[PDB]
Amino acid sequence: AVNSKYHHSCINCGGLNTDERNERGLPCEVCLPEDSPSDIYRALLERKTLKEYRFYHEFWNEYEDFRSFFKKKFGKDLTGYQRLWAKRIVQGKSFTMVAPTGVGKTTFGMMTALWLARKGKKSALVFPTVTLVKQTLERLQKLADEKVKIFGFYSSMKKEEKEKFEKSFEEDDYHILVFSTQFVSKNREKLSQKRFDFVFVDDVDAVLKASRNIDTLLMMVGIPEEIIRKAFSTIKQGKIYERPKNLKPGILVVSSATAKPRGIRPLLFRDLLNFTVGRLVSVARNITHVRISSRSKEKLVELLEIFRDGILIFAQTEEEGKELYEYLKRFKFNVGETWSEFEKNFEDFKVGKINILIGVQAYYGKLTRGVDLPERIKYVIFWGTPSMRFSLELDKAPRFVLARVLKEMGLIKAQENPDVEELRKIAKEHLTQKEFVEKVKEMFRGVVVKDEDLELIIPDVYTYIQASGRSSRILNGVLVKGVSVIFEEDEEIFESLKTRLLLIAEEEIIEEAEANWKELVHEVEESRRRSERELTDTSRSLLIIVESPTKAETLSRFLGRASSRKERNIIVHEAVTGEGVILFTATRGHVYDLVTKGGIHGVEEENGKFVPVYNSLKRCRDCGYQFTEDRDECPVCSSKNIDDKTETLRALREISLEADEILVATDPDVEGEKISWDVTQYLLPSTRSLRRIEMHEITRYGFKKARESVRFVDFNLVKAQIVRRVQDRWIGFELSGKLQKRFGRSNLSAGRVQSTVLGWIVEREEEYKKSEKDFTLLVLENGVNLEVEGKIADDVVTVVELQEAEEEKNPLPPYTTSSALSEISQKLRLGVQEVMDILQDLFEKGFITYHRTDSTRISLEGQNVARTYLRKIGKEDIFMGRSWSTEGAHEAIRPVKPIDARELEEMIEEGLIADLTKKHLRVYELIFNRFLASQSAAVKVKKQIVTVDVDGKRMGIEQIVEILRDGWNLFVPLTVSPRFEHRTYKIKEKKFYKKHTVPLFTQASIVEEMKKRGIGRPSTYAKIVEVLFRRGYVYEDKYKRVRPTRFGVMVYSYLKERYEKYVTEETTRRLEEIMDKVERGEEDYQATLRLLYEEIKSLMEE
């Protein structure tokens, strides 16, 4: 409902269609003239136009055929997982089965094989054991009819059944063949021969013990080994491989990797059949973590009494675990150890004879590789934090400590050296062992440094997450709740565990007094038995579409990348949720853009209203040029290796068919809303289940809270974006074209705002040179320096009036985009564009809120982040609750997690979090300190206002003298000027000089200025400054100040002399304000476009 036009948007003819028609899910006016047909298919047919809309009809029919068949020759309706797998099965696709514990993969395999046998297509079912084969064939024979032809083979075979199998295999008289992995290994040739239209593998790792079996599988679905070798030759080289454009493969469906999918051969499945076979990962965790202040066995016995059945104790050493077992053996609890009688105690605990099992870390970790039954374990008890300890003596040298400390201290060399080498190097320069330890204390932050026993303790957070994760999984539908209890007295180790757990899993560990045990147990058991009612059908498939690959990686990092479909142009990850399956993919940028072909530079004019015409975007991966026109080579470097976006759209359409509900998670500004509307509009004639998300963080919390306020696409944001872009295209092209006649170059003016800023910078030079006054600086005895007007020579300052007061200095509000860009690019020696890239890299990596904001407002959650950090840091006295603003489009720039820069450094150097450079950490530090200083207590200060007399002139100075009560003073430092007595102060030196009273522009002051003047947006600032820079209108001198170039001065002079009315501030501000009003739906859209046109209509005449 924006009345625009998209170029590859017709679903039937594959051509161009309008906004209003794809919104109504219709083909173009050419394919179907009338507005309301009773049925698109038969209408397209009745007008000899039906073309690619056939595929969708055929799809839905031959899907619900599968559905009705499954419902008939089996129980009832499909579950979500089966619904998705079915929708992928009719399109002949291959994929691993992303699902949790026993959802009926074998059932789906049998049913699909049977349904395919109903056509003439032949399938093959592969199983890990030679016993499950028999069970499968049994459950199959009675399930089939007279029609189907099923067989099989194993080790304990019959007499004539063997030769029955061989003979029926010799001349293709089958539809279904059910054999073991043993058969795939042994009879490799026979399988390499045939071509199956369906290959089902129940156990992936059972077959992955031999590359021969991978190659055999690929040669089973119908791939020649020559292609296979020519792909192996590519993946071994490093890069990824594209397959033949029109090659028909068979269907391969497998389970998940029970273990580690090691090797490089598996990658073939990603390049030949377009699916990844990763290990099944589940971040689906519903757990309450509770900590108990000490290892008191009374508390242990009480808890054991409350939990009763399903308890698991983890000890650190085998000795204290032994002692613990000894203690618990006296209290008639049914406890079993794992260090002597293992299999008996495990297979007892597996059934229910034993109620409490005690294991050591490594023991259980390695010996559980067999089974690991989750339905029994409900409570996990830790007798001490699962940690990793290192020696802090000179010898017994840990390499990373030595590396860090030496790199900071004296003999820093390269990036890495041998262990004993660093040992011998630090055996020299260090002061003492004690000084070494102190250096480790100062340097290392985020770990525990026992300088008493010389021990470096680092909480094994991964171990803790697996072990804790034993108490909560997806069982028969419901994410059953669990309880993890830690007995840790060392407060530091607890703090470390808390921040690491909060970082990686976003999970709070609560204290004992805040935990109501009976309630927790009730929860646990209630959900547990609730997972037995067998409704097991809330399963849905979800699709989240984002425009940046980075958001996708950091989405996989908390949703859990299981498999990855190489879908055409894009890559789509799937994961397991509590409510089914989730699919998330990246767009890798914009999709459409204003074509430059027709009308007014692209915007056509029909029916008295303007209509933007969009076309798919193409980026050259070789040079970098972006273009709209549909061509074979790059219109700059003539390369065929171009990345198209219409491909991305086709992929998104097929994916759209395969899912249940679609959410579009583009960023929460106008730009994101446009990419959103392009996508939804293009997808709408495919599925009616599309909505918008607006994530303000990339975290589980951001995801959830954004899904809470899920809505449909807001059109005023779209209209605003379109008006903006149309202005930039119009004034841009026009002025650029006027300058093409005076300077020769064809790519100059990029808009009005850019030329306004150039106006400021260029006009600045003369007023900077102008207002250069002469000053003198005098430093006083028992006083600071003092800058006053020049030529004074009585050599004495006389205090006239004196007054002192006590005042509470509030802190500065949190960084908005302007504040952030300005003060960060000022403090660090960085340009605004690099700072913007950093902020974006921090937001998309889930470390801060939205970096594009014009509001200092902060949520109660953010305040609570401030409080949890102040509480952790030991200074929660100075916490304050300032929300700063009521009016806020978004929220200010704050961190999402109460973790400082140093702690993050530790996490990086260690290996928890990844992909952050020193600059990222510095910027994050700045945002952190700013935000905390915001939410910290006002500093109580004693300040004075001295009226001094110099050369008969009365000058007033005003200085903060005493900090009588601390506050945000610990984050953003505050200085004190020495006290001024009411006497005469002699002048020590009268330094006569001069500085210019109107300073030039830096990049920071440019952003600050166009913020003050209302000339720009949080998304335009750094784009503007960098536009001026890279297009050679501005240079940065020795003091990193912004000065105009000769080119710039000439250009702006031409602009001012010919077109001043169209470029000066007040017009840019008026249009900015007007467009803002358009965004809120206060100002008409077509009317403001009309305004822009009418004012461009006169620029064409000048």
Ligand SMILES: [Zn+2]
């Ligand atoms: Zn059409």
Ligand SMILES: [Zn+2]
């Ligand atoms: Zn190119």
